[PDB]
Amino acid sequence: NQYDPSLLQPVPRSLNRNDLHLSATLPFQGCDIWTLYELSWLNQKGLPQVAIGEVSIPATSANLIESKSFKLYLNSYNQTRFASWDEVQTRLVHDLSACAGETVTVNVKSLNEYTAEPIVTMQGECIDDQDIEIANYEFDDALLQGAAQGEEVSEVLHSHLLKSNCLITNQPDWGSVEIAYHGAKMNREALLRYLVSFREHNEFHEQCVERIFTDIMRYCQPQSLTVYARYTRRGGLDINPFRSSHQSAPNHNQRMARQ
Amino acid sequence: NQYDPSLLQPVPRSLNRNDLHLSATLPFQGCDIWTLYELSWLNQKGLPQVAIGEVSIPATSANLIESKSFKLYLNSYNQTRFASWDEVQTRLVHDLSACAGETVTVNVKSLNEYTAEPIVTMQGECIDDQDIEIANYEFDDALLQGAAQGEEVSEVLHSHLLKSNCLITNQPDWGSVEIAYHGAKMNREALLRYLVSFREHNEFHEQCVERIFTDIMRYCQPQSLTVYARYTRRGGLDINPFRSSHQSAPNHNQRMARQ
Ligand SMILES: Nc1ccnc(=O)[nH]1
Ligand SMILES: Nc1ccnc(=O)[nH]1
Ligand SMILES: [Cl-]
Secondary structure (H helix, E strand, O other): OOOOHHHOOEEEHHHHHHHOOOOOOOOOEEEEEEEEEEEEEEOOOOOEEEEEEEEEEEOOOOEEEOHHHHHHHHHOOOOOEOOOHHHHHHHHHHHHHHHHOOOOEEEEEOHHHHOOOEOOOOOOEEOOOOOOOOOOOOOOHHHHOOOEEEEEEEEEEEEEEEEEEEOOOOOEEEEEEEEEEEEEEEOHHHHHHHHHOOOOOEEOHHHHHHHHHHHHHHHHOOOEEEEEEEEOOEOOEEEEEEEEOOOOOOOOOOOOOOO | OOOOHHHOOEEEHHHHHHHOOOOOOOOOEEEEEEEEEEEEEEOOOOOEEEEEEEEEEEOOOOEEEOHHHHHHHHHOOOOOEOOOHHHHHHHHHHHHHHHHOOOOEEEEEOHHHHOOOEOOOOOOEEOOOOOOOOOOOOOOHHHHOOOEEEEEEEEEEEEEEEEEEEOOOOOEEEEEEEEEEEEEEEOHHHHHHHHHOOOOOEEOHHHHHHHHHHHHHHHHOOOEEEEEEEEOOEOOEEEEEEEEOOOOOOOOOOOOOOO
16 A cells, blocks of 8 residues: 555567567657546645646657556555655656656646646547448558558548557557648548557557557658557556657647547 | 447445435435446447447436446447437437436537536535644544534535545545535534545445435534535546435536546
């Protein structure tokens, strides 16, 4: 029940990226943004404190943090006294930075800081309003083959239809994904079908955004590209991987409808 | 994977209420409001659809619905084709009504209906900003003994500090609770301590709001009382039990910061 930094568990980013056939020199930059909805500890008099945490881990870090460990580690704060909120933020910064292996930023925000904050949508045009018949729910990266055959355009497209099963639990993981690019026009039927083909496939969040990035770069060869997914929480935590050929982070961490 | 109304599981409301020593004639009215964050099915062409559901179950119903069943039942929609959104809403209304045993209302809302909706706080004065030393985290209803000893007032008090372990999983369940009353002034230290004493205790949401109601009525004897808790989601679903001596439902189902 007492605070225990030894609970966290790293996962090497290299494993997954060795699978996308990715080098020691990265095609993307960016970050993994996490929202910690159920962050709670005790003050020095034993009264519970509650807050929301917002964390950003560099995509260049050696490790990401094993989700179930991130969760037990947050749990250990629940019955531990800390004298001030800054103490808590200091601990979160240190431990998450040490686990991931690169400085991680952490904001600890009190709940009143969320009063009147609006729900946001994604940028760009939603592509989910298509009258197409759906074939696959098994994955197929070659769904993007031939998808970019137009005039060179600057677009942002998004879909709320991304879903995949957790490698571990096999329950669905739900998300919206935003794809900004400059290059030959992407066919929206192909792209939507590509996204939908994740449905019954087993995938991990960070792994997912990186695969979408590398498949689009491969198949559609834009000049520039950004892929950003925003997933709904599991066990009090949500993950929002951002990967770009030029931008290092999104402008804010505002929540979407399902999050 | 296909839609299966047989998945739902009722739990008699009478079991819990036989434990609060409550009669066949109810001291409260109200409802259980649920938000279904991850509601998804296929259209008649096999393309996924996503929505948020908002459900209200009468507190007078014979049963509530076993949470893990509610969850598997929603899952069964995920790979099932339905020709229209209204078909889906019709099915949800029927099945949840049949399970609970009284008409349940259901709204199925598209995600764009949430664009720009604000995060709300609770009504009344927060009582969590107290410089008191905390003793218990084991439950004690008699924490309210002697708590109401003032002038007769009309107040609304709320706390974001409600937490208890799930009877099943023993992980914490997190919530904010809003207490509106007219009657002798409640001591805020007592009330806060009473609420905090749920922390390490094992409780069920609906059971929890009903116990807070009956303990306050017992110990503090207000003329009128409303207890409303809003919990954070588990497995895509949140529960918001509302119990009142005069009001049958809250004015809206707007989400709070942690939800
Ligand atoms: N288990 C995990 C799932 C998703 N992201 C992680 O970092 N870890
Ligand atoms: N298992 C459950 C937990 C909370 N509420 C329910 O209705 N069921
Ligand atoms: Cl969850």
